[PDB]
Design a protein around this motif. Structure first.
Motif, PDB file in Angstrom:
ATOM      1  N   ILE A 282       0.846  -1.183   0.000  1.00  0.00           N
ATOM      2  CA  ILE A 282       0.000   0.000   0.000  1.00  0.00           C
ATOM      3  C   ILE A 282       0.885   1.238   0.000  1.00  0.00           C
ATOM      4  CG2 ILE A 282      -1.605   1.370   1.427  1.00  0.00           C
ATOM      5  CD1 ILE A 282      -3.089  -0.999   2.112  1.00  0.00           C
ATOM      6  N   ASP A 283       0.428   2.275  -0.696  1.00  0.00           N
ATOM      7  CA  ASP A 283       1.094   3.565  -0.711  1.00  0.00           C
ATOM      8  C   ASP A 283       0.081   4.660  -0.411  1.00  0.00           C
ATOM      9  OD1 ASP A 283      -0.354   3.356  -3.030  1.00  0.00           O
ATOM     10  OD2 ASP A 283       1.164   4.283  -4.318  1.00  0.00           O
ATOM     11  N   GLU A 284       0.595   5.801   0.052  1.00  0.00           N
ATOM     12  CA  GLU A 284      -0.215   6.984   0.340  1.00  0.00           C
ATOM     13  C   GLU A 284      -1.316   6.646   1.345  1.00  0.00           C
ATOM     14  OE1 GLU A 284      -1.064   9.388  -3.105  1.00  0.00           O
ATOM     15  OE2 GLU A 284       0.087   8.040  -4.400  1.00  0.00           O
ATOM     16  N   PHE A 285      -0.878   6.330   2.559  1.00  0.00           N
ATOM     17  CA  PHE A 285      -1.753   5.793   3.590  1.00  0.00           C
ATOM     18  C   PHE A 285      -2.795   6.787   4.081  1.00  0.00           C
ATOM     19  CE2 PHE A 285      -2.286   3.196   7.575  1.00  0.00           C
ATOM     20  CZ  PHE A 285      -2.683   2.058   6.903  1.00  0.00           C
ATOM     21  N   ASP A 286      -2.833   8.004   3.547  1.00  0.00           N
ATOM     22  CA  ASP A 286      -3.891   8.953   3.862  1.00  0.00           C
ATOM     23  C   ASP A 286      -4.890   9.132   2.731  1.00  0.00           C
ATOM     24  OD1 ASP A 286      -3.669   9.630   6.474  1.00  0.00           O
ATOM     25  OD2 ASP A 286      -2.975  11.689   6.151  1.00  0.00           O
ATOM     26  N   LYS A 287      -4.694   8.464   1.597  1.00  0.00           N
ATOM     27  CA  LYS A 287      -5.616   8.595   0.479  1.00  0.00           C
ATOM     28  C   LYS A 287      -6.790   7.632   0.569  1.00  0.00           C
ATOM     29  CE  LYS A 287      -5.240   6.439  -3.264  1.00  0.00           C
ATOM     30  NZ  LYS A 287      -5.809   5.177  -3.800  1.00  0.00           N
ATOM     31  N   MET A 288      -6.633   6.509   1.259  1.00  0.00           N
ATOM     32  CA  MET A 288      -7.668   5.489   1.244  1.00  0.00           C
ATOM     33  C   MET A 288      -8.932   5.984   1.933  1.00  0.00           C
ATOM     34  SD  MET A 288      -6.055   3.739  -0.596  1.00  0.00           S
ATOM     35  CE  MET A 288      -7.520   2.775  -0.959  1.00  0.00           C
ATOM     36  N   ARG A 289     -10.073   5.540   1.406  1.00  0.00           N
ATOM     37  CA  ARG A 289     -11.382   5.971   1.876  1.00  0.00           C
ATOM     38  C   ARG A 289     -11.502   5.808   3.384  1.00  0.00           C
ATOM     39  NH1 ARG A 289     -14.635   2.648  -2.936  1.00  0.00           N
ATOM     40  NH2 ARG A 289     -12.976   2.890  -4.501  1.00  0.00           N
ATOM     41  N   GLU A 290     -12.106   6.810   4.030  1.00  0.00           N
ATOM     42  CA  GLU A 290     -12.256   6.833   5.482  1.00  0.00           C
ATOM     43  C   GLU A 290     -12.803   5.515   6.024  1.00  0.00           C
ATOM     44  OE1 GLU A 290     -11.449   9.472   7.376  1.00  0.00           O
ATOM     45  OE2 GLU A 290     -12.274   8.878   9.320  1.00  0.00           O
ATOM     46  N   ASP A 291     -13.944   5.081   5.483  1.00  0.00           N
ATOM     47  CA  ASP A 291     -14.497   3.779   5.841  1.00  0.00           C
ATOM     48  C   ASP A 291     -13.490   2.663   5.592  1.00  0.00           C
ATOM     49  OD1 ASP A 291     -16.267   4.617   2.977  1.00  0.00           O
ATOM     50  OD2 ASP A 291     -14.730   3.055   2.942  1.00  0.00           O
ATOM     51  N   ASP A 292     -12.826   2.702   4.436  1.00  0.00           N
ATOM     52  CA  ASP A 292     -11.856   1.674   4.087  1.00  0.00           C
ATOM     53  C   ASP A 292     -10.685   1.674   5.058  1.00  0.00           C
ATOM     54  OD1 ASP A 292     -10.622  -0.353   2.773  1.00  0.00           O
ATOM     55  OD2 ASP A 292     -10.415   0.689   0.855  1.00  0.00           O
ATOM     56  N   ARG A 293     -10.248   2.858   5.496  1.00  0.00           N
ATOM     57  CA  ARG A 293      -9.130   2.904   6.431  1.00  0.00           C
ATOM     58  C   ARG A 293      -9.542   2.370   7.795  1.00  0.00           C
ATOM     59  NH1 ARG A 293      -6.434   6.099   9.881  1.00  0.00           N
ATOM     60  NH2 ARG A 293      -8.063   7.713   9.769  1.00  0.00           N
ATOM     61  N   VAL A 294     -10.759   2.689   8.233  1.00  0.00           N
ATOM     62  CA  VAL A 294     -11.276   2.091   9.463  1.00  0.00           C
ATOM     63  C   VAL A 294     -11.256   0.570   9.363  1.00  0.00           C
ATOM     64  CG1 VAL A 294     -13.266   1.901  10.945  1.00  0.00           C
ATOM     65  CG2 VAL A 294     -12.665   4.110   9.980  1.00  0.00           C
TER      66      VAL A 294
END
Ligand SMILES: Nc1ncnc2c1ncn2[C@@H]1O[C@H](COP(=O)(O)OP(=O)(O)OP(O)(O)=S)[C@@H](O)[C@H]1O
Ligand SMILES: Nc1ncnc2c1ncn2[C@@H]1O[C@H](COP(=O)(O)OP(=O)(O)OP(O)(O)=S)[C@@H](O)[C@H]1O
Ligand SMILES: Nc1ncnc2c1ncn2[C@@H]1O[C@H](COP(=O)(O)OP(=O)(O)OP(O)(O)=S)[C@@H](O)[C@H]1O
Ligand SMILES: [Mg+2]
Ligand SMILES: [Mg+2]
Ligand SMILES: [Mg+2]
Ligand SMILES: [Zn+2]
Ligand SMILES: [Zn+2]
Lengths: 563, 79, 232, 598
Positions: free
Chosen positions: B34-46
Motif C-alpha cells: 500500500i502507498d499513500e496511507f492517507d488517500k484510502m477511503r475513510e471507511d476503508d481505512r477504518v
DNA sequence: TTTTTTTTTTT
C-alpha cells in the motif's frame, strides 16, 4: 343473381362527374381541368376540390356528401378515374383520390361522439407523434393456385380477408390462394396521433387524444409539434387479433395549417413576397421604411409594462435572430441569441415570457420545477406494438426554430441542468440508449427567467454567487438583465397609475400602432435576409472589443461575469 | 476499484445489498503493498485498521452478516 | 413470525372462505381456521388450498368471547361498590410497586371520554398520555401491559419505525406496476390504543406525522397514486 | 306484467300530490315537470322512486326488482301522457324516465349476490374516467354474391348471422360491414367510498360503473355523486380462445342517474342556468337584505357559528367566497388574470386554525383537504402513471387541479420540505400548470384558491424576533398571498374567561338557504367595475404601503399587492350587490389588509 | 434482461 344498383351512390357519382366539368372560375376556363393537369406526372394522385364551390354549383349534392361520406367515397374516386382518361398517358391501373377542404363548420375532439361515424367532419388539434410510412393493400389480386387463374379485385377490410371463392367450377382449393404482389394495388399509410388543442381544454381536465390516419399523397403533411386542421371521417376499427372490441379512429383525407400567416397557399423573400396581398405588401413596405421602428415595436409588443426599456429591446433582438453560418470543416456557428432575466420578486419577469409565448407562433412554455431531462430534450419509449424503442420529441425539439420559454430556470435539478447545457452548446441533442443511436437538431432560442439566491439580489457580489446555475451555462447566454426593485417613489406612482388604468379600462388604454397580426407578417418577412459586414463596420467592431476589455481593467472598478 | 476490505453495494439487478470482499480476502497468506496511507477511503481505512487488528473482516449490514478470514501481510508506505 | 425457526422464511396457505364465514376476518389479524385441506383441480405435483369450515378470531390470545361477554350480578356486586374505580387502578400491572397515580390515569386512557359534534365542529373523545421520566422506572413495562389489555392494540418503537410506516404508505407491485395503499400502525389500531416507547429518539421528520392523528384523527394522503383520508 | 304496469304508472304520473315544496297546491307535479320538458329541450324526467312508494307498493316492488323489464314500460307510459303537448312542440328523440333516491341505500361493502340485477344506490367520489367506447346495436350484413344488404337487430344481447342471402342462397356469404352499422356510447368510471361510512381501520374500495348513451360525459374526476343504477355481473373467460369461463363472476353497475346536489354545501357552478330558476319572491329578499347598513358583518358573523369572535378572519374567509371580477384580458395580450383570493393563517397553537379549514372544506363544494407530510410534489399538481393495461405513460391530476373551482385547504403548511413547497408558485399565481415529461407536453389550468395554515418557527410566537422571522417563509411566496392573518395568544384574563364560558357551552347541546342563495345570486348577476373616485384612492393606498412596509422589516410590499387591493375591493362590492366600486369599498379592504398583521 | 416516473429504505 346479378348485383344491386347502389343508387344513392351512383347518382352521386354521376352528378359529381358533371360538376367536375361544368364548374368554371371567374373567367370561364373550367378550373378542375387545369388543376387536374399536373395530376399526370408521377407522384401526384390527389385532386383537391374545395367544398364551398361544390355548394355554389349544387346543393342537393352537398347534403349527400356531408351525410354519406363513407358510402359514396369509393365512387367519387372512380368518377375521377374516368374524368382523367382524356390524357392517355396515365398507367391504366393507377388510381386517384379526392381531397376536400374548406368545410363551413368546425368541431372539437370532445364533440366526436359515436353519432358521427361515417359522416364528414372537421377537426383541429396539435400533433404528438408520427409513425413511419407504410404500404397498405387496398385491392389484392389473388393468383389462384390450382386453376392457375387469377381471382381479381378483392377488397380487404382491416385484415388480409382471404377471399375463398373461385369463378372456376374446378377450384381444388377454396381455402388456398397465393396472391401476387406485383399487380396488386397499394397506397401509402401513415398513422399519427393528435392531442386536443389548447384553447378548447375545459378547465381542470387532461387533454384527450385520437389516432388520425393519413392515407394518400397527404402522407407526411403533419409533423410533430404542428397545429394542423384535419378534415375526414370518423370510422370504427375492430381488434383484428380475434378476427369484438371497437375503437374510434379518425380517417383524414385533407390536412392544412389552422391559420395561414399568408393566406395564399402553403421559402425565400420572393416566394413569400408573392403571397403578400396588396394591403399586406403596402403595409410591410410602410413599416420597413418607418423611422423610429425600434421604438414602436417595443411600445406595441409590451403595451402594459411600464419601464425596463432595456429589456424589451433585448427581447426584440432575440425574436429577430442572427445569421446562422456553417464553417467549411463541418461545424456550425450558433445563429440565434439566448436571453436570461434575473430579478427581485414581482418585477414582471413571467410577464415578458407570457407575452412572448402568446405572441410568437411555434414557441413553447415550460416551468422548471415540473419538467424532466428526458422531457425537455428527447426521450426513448418502448412501443410494444412494434416492440421497439423509438424516439420521442421534447420541448426543446417541438419548438425548433422558435423560442423555448423556461420559467424558474434555477429550480431544475442538478442533472436536469446538464442535459440542457449539452443542447445549448452544440445546438444538437445526442441519444445513446437501449437500441437507439441518433443526433437531432435543435435551433431554438431560449428565454429563461430565474430568481436570485435567497429572494433578493445582493449588489455586492458577482453573479456566480447570486444565482445557483452551473458554471458552463452562465457562459452560453451572453445577455443578462439583472432587475432590481430600487426602493423609489416616482416609479411607485407610475406603475400604480398604469396598473389601475389597465384594470379600469380593461380593453382600452392600449393604443399600440402595428396591430399584433401585422407584426407577425413583418417578422416572417424580415427574417429572410442575411446582412453582411462592411469593412468600416468590421473596424468599428474590433475597436469596440478593444474598448470593452479594458473597462474590466484593473485598479479603478470591478464587474461581474468577467468579459 | 471495489476497495481493500469488504463493501456492501446495492446491486442493480437484485436492487439489494451484496458483499464485495476486496483484496485482503483474496490474499491468502500472501502480501499486500500500500502507498499513500492517507488517500484510502475513510471507511476503508477504518476497516483495514480492524482487519490488521483481528485478522478477519465481519460486516453486519443491511442483509449481510458474514466473515472473511484476512491472512496476508501489510507493507505500507507513508508520507 | 414468532413460531418460525430462528431465521427461516414464513410459509403461506390459501383459504377459500365462502357462504356464511365471509366478512369475518380483517387483514392483519390473528385467526384460527378449521377446514379440509384439498388439492387444486387441473403432471402429478399439486398445489393445495384450505377450504374453510369455521373461522374464529383469537386476538385476545384465547378466543373471541363477545357473545359470553355479559357480566353477572355477582360481578355487578363489585362494579357497584363504593370504590370500583380504585380497585381497577390497583389491579393494573400488579407486578410493579408504587405508581399509585399513574395507574389511575392509564385507566382513563383505556376508558376514554365522550366526543361531541355541535354545529358541525368535531371534538375528539380520546386521551393521549406521555410518561417522561428517569431511567429504570418500569415505563416499558407499563406500556407492554397496556398493550395486552386492549382489544385493538399496537406496539411500536421510535427508533425502529419510519414516519410513513406509522400513518400509511403507498407501495408499488412489480407484478402489475400499480400503486396501492397500505395502512400503518395508527390505522391498524383504529378503535384502540397505540404504544410508542423510545419517543424522544424518533427522527424529527418522522414525528410530525403524528400531529394529524392526534387532533383530527384522520390521515390525509395525496401521494402520486392515491388521494384520500383514512380514519384513524 | 307489461300492460298491468303502465296503467298503474300513468295514474301515479297524473294524480300525485306531495306535502313538500319545490323550486322555492300545484297538483300536477309530474305533469308540471312534463310541461317544463315540453317548453324546453332536455327530454329526461327525473322521477323519485319513493313518491311511487307512497302512491303504490306493488310497482315499487317491481321497479327495484325487475328494473330492466320495467323502465321501458315507464318510458312508454310517459310518451302517451305527453298527449297534452303533442301538437304544440314536436321534439324528436323520445321521453325518458329516471328513478332515483334522495338518500343512499347501501355501501360498497354490503353488495350481496341476492342483489344481482336490481336497482341499487351507492355514493362515492369519482376517481377517473375513460374515453368513449363504441358498442354495436344494429348489424348490417352484405353478401358477396347477391350484394344484398340485410340489417339484423340485436334483441337479446347478441347478434345472429342470417346465413342465407334472400336472393342468391350461397348459404354463407353475408359479411359484416362495420362502418355501415349503428353504434352507441359507453364510458367506464370508478367510484371510491367516502371516508365516512366505512369500517374500523380499513382502506377504501372501488367500484366500476358503466355509463351509457346520454349519461356518457356528465361527471368529472373529483366529484361526489350519488349514483343510482342496476347491479350486474358478467362472466369472464380464462383464455381469450376457449369457452372455459371461470366460476367467480365479475361485477359492475349500469348507471341510470347521477345526483351532485347535496344539501349542506353551496351551489356548484353547474347551476348557473339554474340561477334564472329563482323564485322572484326570493330576489326581493336578497335585494332587500343587501340594503341594511351592515349586511357584511351580518353574513360574516354567520360563518361557523362555533368559533369564538375572531372577527376579522371570518371577514377574509367571506370575501374569499366571492372573489374579484372575471375580467377578459385576451386583447391586451397580457394573458389571464387571477380573480380568487389566497389566505394564509399563521399563529401559535391552540388558536383554532385547523377548525376553520375543517369547516370551510365541509362548506364549499369541489374542495380538498391536504396536510403537511402526507402530500408530495407531484401528488398535488399532476403525476404520470404507467397505465396498467396499455402499458403506456398517461397523465393524471393531483389535488390542486381536482379542486379547480373551490378551495384547496393545505394544513401544516410549514412542515413541507422546500421542494414540494416551491410547486405552488405556478398554480397559485398564474392559474396554470405547464408539464413537460416523457411523452406528455401540455399545459393545464385551474381556478383554485389556496387557504393555508402554518405555525411560527419554534411553534411559539416569541416577540423578540421580527415578523419576517417568526414566519420564516421566503418573499417570493409570501407575496402570492394577500391576507396573512397573524393570530396570537394574548393573556388577557377577560378573554380567557369569555372563551372558556363559550367552550363549555358546546357540551350541553341567520339561516343557510339565505346565504346558500345569496352567494349563487351574487355570483350570477354582478360585475363590479371600478370608478374614477375609487381609482384615485387606490394609487395613494399603494404609495404609502411602500414607505410603511420598507422600514419595519415586517413584510415588504411589491406591486402585486396593488392588484390584491383590487381583488379585495371588488370582492367587497359584490357582497352588497353594488355593481360599481366606490371609495368606501377601498377603505374597507385597505383597513382589512393593514389590520391583519398586527 | 433495456426507458421513464415516483415512493421509501439504505449505504
Ligand atoms: N414594472 C411593472 N409594470 C407593470 N406591471 C408590473 C410591473 N412589475 C410588476 N407588475 C405587475 O405585478 C405582477 C408581477 O408578477 P410577476 O411578474 O408574475 O412575477 P415575477 O416578476 O415573475 O416574480 P416572482 O419571482 O416570479 S414572484 C403582475 O401582475 C404585473 O402586471
Ligand atoms: N417499581 C418497580 N416495580 C416493578 N419493577 C420495577 C420497578 N422499577 C423497576 N422495575 C424493573 O426494572 C426494570 C426496568 O426496565 P424498564 O421497564 O425497561 O425501564 P424503563 O422505564 O423502560 O427505562 P428506560 O426508559 O427504557 S432507560 C424492569 O425489569 C422492571 O420490572
Ligand atoms: N376561539 C376559539 N373558538 C372555538 N374553539 C376554540 C377556540 N380556540 C380554541 N378552540 C378549541 O381549541 C382547540 C384548538 O385546536 P385546533 O383548532 O386544532 O388548533 P390548531 O391551530 O390546529 O393548533 P396547532 O397549531 O395546529 S397544534 C379545538 O378543540 C378548538 O375547538
Ligand atoms: Mg414569475
Ligand atoms: Mg424502556
Ligand atoms: Mg392545526
Ligand atoms: Zn380456382
Ligand atoms: Zn347473397
Amino acid at each position: 343473381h346479378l348485383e344491386v344498383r347502389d343508387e344513392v351512390a351512383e347518382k352521386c357519382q354521376k352528378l359529381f362527374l358533371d360538376f367536375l366539368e361544368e364548374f368554371q372560375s371567374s373567367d370561364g376556363e373550367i378550373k378542375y381541368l387545369q388543376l387536374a393537369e399536373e395530376l399526370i406526372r408521377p407522384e401526384r394522385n390527389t385532386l383537391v376540390v374545395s367544398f364551398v364551390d361544390l355548394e355554389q354549383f349544387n346543393q342537393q349534392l352537398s347534403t349527400t356528401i356531408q351525410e354519406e361520406f363513407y358510402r359514396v367515397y369509393p365512387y367519387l374516386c372512380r368518377a375521377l378515374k374516368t374524368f382523367v382518361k382524356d390524357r392517355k398517358e396515365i398507367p391504366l391501373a393507377k388510381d386517384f383520390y379526392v381531397a376536400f377542404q374548406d368545410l363551413p363548420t368546425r368541431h372539437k375532439i370532445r364533440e366526436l361522439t359515436s353519432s358521427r361515424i361515417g359522416l364528414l367532419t372537421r377537426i383541429s388539434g396539435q400533433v404528438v407523434r408520427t409513425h413511419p410510412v407504410h404500404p397498405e393493400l387496398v385491392s389484392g389480386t389473388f393468383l389462384c393456385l390450382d386453376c392457375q387463374t387469377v381471382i381479381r379485385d378483392v377488397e380487404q377490410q382491416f385484415k388480409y380477408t382471404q377471399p375463398n371463392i373461385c369463378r372456376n367450377p374446378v377450384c381444388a382449393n377454396r381455402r388456398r390462394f397465393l396472391l401476387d404482389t406485383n399487380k396488386s394495388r397499394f397506397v401509402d399509410f401513415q398513422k399519427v396521433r393528435i392531442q386536443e388543442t389548447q384553447a378548447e381544454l375545459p378547465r381542470g381536465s387532461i387533454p384527450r387524444s385520437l389516432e388520425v390516419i393519413l392515407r394518400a399523397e397527404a402522407v407526411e403533411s403533419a409533423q410533430a409539434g404542428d397545429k394542423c386542421d384535419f378534415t375526414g371521417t370518423l370510422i370504427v376499427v375492430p381488434d383484428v387479433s380475434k378476427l369484438l372490441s371497437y375503437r374510434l379512429v379518425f380517417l383524414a383525407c385533407c390536412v392544412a395549417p389552422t391559420n395561414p400567416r399568408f393566406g395564399g397557399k402553403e421559402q425565400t423573400a420572393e416566394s413569400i413576397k408573392n403571397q403578400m396581398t396588396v394591403k399586406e405588401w403596402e403595409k410591410v413596405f410602410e413599416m420597413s421604411q418607418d423611422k423610429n421602428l425600434y421604438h414602436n415595436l417595443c411600445t406595441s409588443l409590451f403595451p402594459t409594462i411600464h419601464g425596463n426599456d432595456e429589456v424589451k429591446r433585448g427581447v426584440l433582438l432575440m425574436l429577430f435572430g442572427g445569421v446562422p453560418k456553417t464553417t467549411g470543416e463541418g461545424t456550425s456557428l450558433r445563429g440565434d441569441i439566448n436571453v436570461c432575466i434575473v430579478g427581485d420578486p414581482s418585477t414582471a419577469k413571467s410577464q415578458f415570457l407570457k407575452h412572448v409565448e402568446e405572441f410568437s407562433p411555434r414557441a413553447v412554455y415550460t416551468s422548471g420545477k415540473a419538467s424532466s431531462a428526458a422531457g425537455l430534450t428527447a426521450a426513448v419509449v418502448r412501443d410494444e406494438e412494434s416492440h421497439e424503442f423509438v424516439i420521442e420529441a421534447g420541448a426543446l425539439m417541438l419548438a425548433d426554430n422558435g423560442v423555448c420559454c423556461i420559467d424558474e430556470f434555477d429550480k431544475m435539478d442538478v442533472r436536469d441542468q446538464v442535459a440542457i447545457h449539452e443542447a445549448m452548446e452544440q445546438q444538437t441533442i445526442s441519444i445513446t440508449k437501449a437500441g437507439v443511436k441518433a443526433t437531432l437538431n435543435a435551433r431554438t432560442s431560449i428565454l429563461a427567467a430565474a430568481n436570485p439566491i435567497s429572494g433578493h439580489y445582493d449588489r455586492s457580489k458577482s453573479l456566480k454567487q447570486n444565482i445557483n446555475l452551473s458554471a458552463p451555462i452562465m457562459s452560453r447566454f451572453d445577455l443578462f438583465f439583472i432587475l432590481v426593485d430600487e426602493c423609489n417613489e416616482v416609479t411607485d406612482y407610475a406603475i400604480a397609475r398604469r396598473i389601475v388604468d389597465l384594470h379600469s379600462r380593461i380593453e382600452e388604454s392600449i393604443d399600440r400602432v402595428y396591430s399584433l397580426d401585422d407584426i407577425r407578417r413583418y417578422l416572417l418577412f424580415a427574417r429572410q435576409f442575411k446582412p453582411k459586414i462592411s469593412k468600416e463596420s468590421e473596424d468599428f467592431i474590433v475597436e469596440q472589443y478593444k474598448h470593452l476589455r479594458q473597462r474590466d481593467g484593473s485598479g479603478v472598478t470591478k464587474s461581474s461575469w468577467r468579459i | 476499484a471495489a476497495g481493500l476490505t469488504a463493501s456492501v453495494m446495492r446491486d442493480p439487478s437484485s436492487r439489494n445489498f451484496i458483499m464485495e470482499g476486496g483484496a485482503m480476502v483474496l490474499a491468502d497468506g500472501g502480501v499486500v503493498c500500500i502507498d499513500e496511507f492517507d488517500k484510502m477511503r475513510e471507511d476503508d481505512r477504518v476497516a483495514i485498521h480492524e482487519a490488521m487488528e483481528q485478522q478477519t473482516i465481519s460486516i453486519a449490514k443491511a442483509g449481510i452478516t458474514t466473515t472473511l478470514n484476512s491472512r496476508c501481510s501489510v507493507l505500507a508506505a507513508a508520507n | 413470525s414468532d413460531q418460525v425457526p430462528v431465521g427461516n422464511i414464513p410459509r403461506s396457505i390459501t383459504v377459500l372462505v365462502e357462504g356464511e364465514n365471509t366478512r369475518i376476518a380483517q387483514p392483519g389479524d390473528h385467526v384460527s381456521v378449521t377446514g379440509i385441506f384439498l388439492p387444486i383441480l387441473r403432471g402429478l405435483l399439486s398445489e393445495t388450498y384450505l377450504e374453510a369450515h369455521r373461522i374464529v378470531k383469537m386476538n385476545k390470545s384465547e378466543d373471541d368471547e363477545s357473545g359470553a361477554g355479559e357480566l353477572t350480578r355477582e360481578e355487578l356486586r363489585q362494579i357497584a361498590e363504593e370504590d370500583f374505580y380504585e380497585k381497577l387502578a390497583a389491579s393494573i400491572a400488579p407486578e410493579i410497586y408504587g405508581h399509585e397515580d399513574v395507574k389511575k390515569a392509564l385507566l382513563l386512557l383505556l376508558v376514554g371520554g365522550v366526543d361531541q359534534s355541535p354545529r358541525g365542529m368535531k371534538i375528539r373523545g380520546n386521551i393521549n398520555i406521555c410518561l417522561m421520566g428517569d431511567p429504570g422506572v418500569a415505563k416499558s413495562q407499563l406500556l407492554s401491559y397496556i398493550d395486552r389489555l386492549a382489544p385493538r392494540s399496537q406496539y411500536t418503537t421510535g427508533r425502529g419505525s419510519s414516519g410513513v410506516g406509522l400513518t400509511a404508505a403507498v407501495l408499488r407491485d412489480s407484478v402489475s406496476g400499480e400503486l396501492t395503499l397500505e395502512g400503518g400502525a395508527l390505522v391498524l389500531a383504529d378503535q384502540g390504543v397505540c404504544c410508542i416507547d423510545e419517543f424522544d429518539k424518533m427522527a424529527e421528520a418522522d414525528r410530525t406525522a403524528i400531529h394529524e392523528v392526534m387532533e383530527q384523527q384522520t390521515i390525509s394522503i395525496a401521494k402520486a397514486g392515491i388521494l384520500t383520508t383514512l380514519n384513524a | 306484467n307489461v300492460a298491468a304496469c303502465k296503467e298503474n304508472f300513468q295514474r301515479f304520473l297524473q294524480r300525485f300530490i306531495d306535502p313538500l315544496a319545490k323550486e322555492e297546491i300545484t297538483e300536477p307535479l309530474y305533469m308540471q315537470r312534463l310541461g317544463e320538458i315540453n317548453v324546453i329541450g332536455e327530454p329526461f324526467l327525473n322521477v323519485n322512486c319513493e313518491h311511487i312508494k307512497s302512491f303504490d307498493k306493488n310497482l315499487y316492488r317491481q321497479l327495484i326488482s325487475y328494473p330492466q323489464e320495467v323502465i321501458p314500460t315507464f318510458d312508454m307510459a310517459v310518451n302517451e301522457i305527453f298527449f297534452d303537448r303533442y301538437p304544440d312542440s314536436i321534439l324528436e328523440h323520445q321521453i325518458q324516465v329516471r328513478p332515483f333516491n334522495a338518500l343512499k341505500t347501501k355501501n360498497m361493502r354490503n353488495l350481496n349476490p341476492e342483489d344481482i340485477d336490481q336497482l341499487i344506490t351507492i355514493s362515492g367520489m369519482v376517481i377517473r374516467t375513460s374515453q368513449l367506447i363504441p358498442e354495436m346495436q344494429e348489424a348490417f350484413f352484405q353478401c358477396q354474391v347477391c350484394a344484398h344488404t340485410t340489417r339484423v337487430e340485436m334483441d337479446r344481447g347478441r347478434i345472429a348471422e342470417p346465413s342465407v342471402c334472400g336472393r342468391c342462397h350461397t348459404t354463407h356469404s353475408m359479411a359484416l360491414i362495420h362502418n355501415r352499422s349503428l353504434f352507441s356510447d359507453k364510458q367506464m368510471i370508478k367510484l371510491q367510498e367516502s371516508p365516512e361510512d366505512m369500517p374500523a381501520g380499513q382502506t377504501p374500495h372501488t367500484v366500476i360503473l358503466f355509463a351509457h348513451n346520454d349519461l356518457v360525459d356528465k361527471v368529472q374526476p373529483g366529484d361526489r355523486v350519488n349514483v343510482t343504477g342496476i347491479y350486474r355481473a358478467v362472466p369472464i373467460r380464462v383464455n381469450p380462445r376457449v369457452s372455459n369461463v371461470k366460476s367467480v363472476y365479475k361485477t359492475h353497475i349500469d348507471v341510470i342517474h347521477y345526483r351532485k346536489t347535496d344539501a349542506k354545501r353551496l351551489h356548484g357552478l353547474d347551476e348557473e342556468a339554474e340561477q334564472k330558476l329563482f323564485s322572484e319572491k326570493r330576489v326581493e329578499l336578497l335585494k332587500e337584505l343587501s340594503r341594511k347598513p351592515d349586511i357584511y358583518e351580518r353574513l360574516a358573523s354567520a360563518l361557523a357559528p362555533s368559533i369564538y369572535e375572531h372577527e376579522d378572519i371570518k371577514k377574509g374567509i367571506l370575501l374569499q367566497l366571492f372573489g374579484g371580477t372575471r375580467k377578459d384580458f385576451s386583447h391586451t395580450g397580457r394573458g389571464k388574470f387571477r380573480a380568487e383570493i389566497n389566505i394564509l393563517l399563521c399563529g401559535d397553537p391552540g388558536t383554532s386554525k385547523s377548525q376553520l379549514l375543517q369547516y370551510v372544506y365541509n362548506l364549499v363544494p369541489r374542495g380538498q383537504y391536504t396536510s403537511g407530510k402526507g402530500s408530495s410534489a407531484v401528488g398535488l399538481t399532476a403525476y404520470v402513471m404507467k397505465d396498467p393495461e396499455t402499458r403506456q405513460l398517461v397523465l393524471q391530476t393531483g389535488a390542486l387541479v381536482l379542486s379547480d373551482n373551490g378551495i384547496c385547504c393545505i394544513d401544516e403548511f410549514d412542515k413541507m420540505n422546500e421542494s414540494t413547497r416551491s410547486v405552488l408558485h405556478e398554480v397559485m399565481e398564474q392559474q396554470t400548470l405547464s408539464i413537460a415529461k416523457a411523452g406528455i407536453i401540455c399545459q393545464l389550468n385551474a381556478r383554485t384558491s389556496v387557504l393555508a395554515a402554518a405555525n411560527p418557527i419554534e411553534s411559539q410566537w416569541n416577540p423578540k424576533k421580527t415578523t419576517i422571522e417568526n414566519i420564516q417563509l421566503p418573499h417570493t411566496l409570501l407575496s402570492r398571498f394577500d391576507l396573512i392573518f397573524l393570530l396570537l395568544d394574548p393573556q388577557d384574563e377577560a378573554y380567557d374567561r369569555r372563551l372558556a364560558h363559550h367552550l363549555v357551552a358546546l357540551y350541553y347541546q341567520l339561516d343557510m338557504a339565505v346565504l346558500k342563495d345569496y352567494i349563487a345570486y351574487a355570483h350570477s348577476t354582478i360585475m363590479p367595475r371600478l370608478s374614477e373616485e375609487a381609482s384615485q384612492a387606490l394609487i395613494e393606498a399603494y404609495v404609502d404601503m411602500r414607505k410603511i412596509g420598507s422600514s419595519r422589516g415586517m413584510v415588504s410590499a411589491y406591486p402585486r399587492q396593488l392588484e390584491s387591493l383590487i381583488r379585495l375591493a371588488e370582492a367587497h362590492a359584490k357582497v352588497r350587490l353594488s355593481n360599481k366600486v366606490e371609495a368606501i369599498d377601498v377603505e374597507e379592504a385597505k383597513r382589512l389588509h393593514r389590520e391583519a398583521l398586527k
